[PDB]
């Protein structure tokens, strides 16, 4: 169980890392394309930051 446990943990951490890209963090969207396609430079810099 120990070796399978560390394999499962190493898989679960990497799967959790890629699932956290869908958060907005207080911005308009989690995608950088529509933020640049809908806003000017000044506000898009704030959202991207």
Partner 1 sequence: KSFTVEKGIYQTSNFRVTPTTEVVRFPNITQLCPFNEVFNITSFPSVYAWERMRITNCVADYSVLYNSSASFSTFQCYGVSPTKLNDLCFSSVYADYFVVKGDDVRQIAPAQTGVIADYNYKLPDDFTGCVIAWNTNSLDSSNEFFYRRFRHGKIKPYGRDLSNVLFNPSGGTCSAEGLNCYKPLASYGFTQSSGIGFQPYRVVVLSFELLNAPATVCGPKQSTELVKNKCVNFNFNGLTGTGVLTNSTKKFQPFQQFGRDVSDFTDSVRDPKTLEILDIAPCSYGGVSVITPGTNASSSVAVLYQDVNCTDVPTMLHADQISHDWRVYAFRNDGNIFQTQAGCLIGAAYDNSSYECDIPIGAGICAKYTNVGHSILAYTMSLGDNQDIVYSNNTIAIPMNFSISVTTEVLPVSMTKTSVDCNMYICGDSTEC
Task: List interacting residues with a second copy (CB under 8 A).
Answer: 16, 19-20, 22-26, 46, 49
Q: How far is the CB of 33 from a second copy (least distance, A)?
A: 19
- For residue 44, the surrounding DSSP H or E stretch is helix 41-48
Cβ neighbors of 13 (< 8 A, separation 6 or more) are none
Q: List residues binding partner 1 (CB under 8 A).
A: 2-3, 6-7, 10, 14, 18-19, 21-22, 30-34, 36-42, 48
Q: How far is the CB of 32 from partner 1 (least distance, A)?
A: 5
In whole angstroms, what is the distance from residue 8 CA to residue 5 CA? 5
């Amino acid at each position: 169980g120990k070796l399978q446990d560390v394999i499962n943990q190493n898989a679960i951490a990497l799967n959790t890392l890629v699932k956290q890209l869908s958060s907005n963090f207080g911005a308009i969207s989690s995608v950088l394309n529509d933020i640049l396609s809908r806003l000017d430079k000044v506000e898009a810099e704030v959202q991207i930051d």
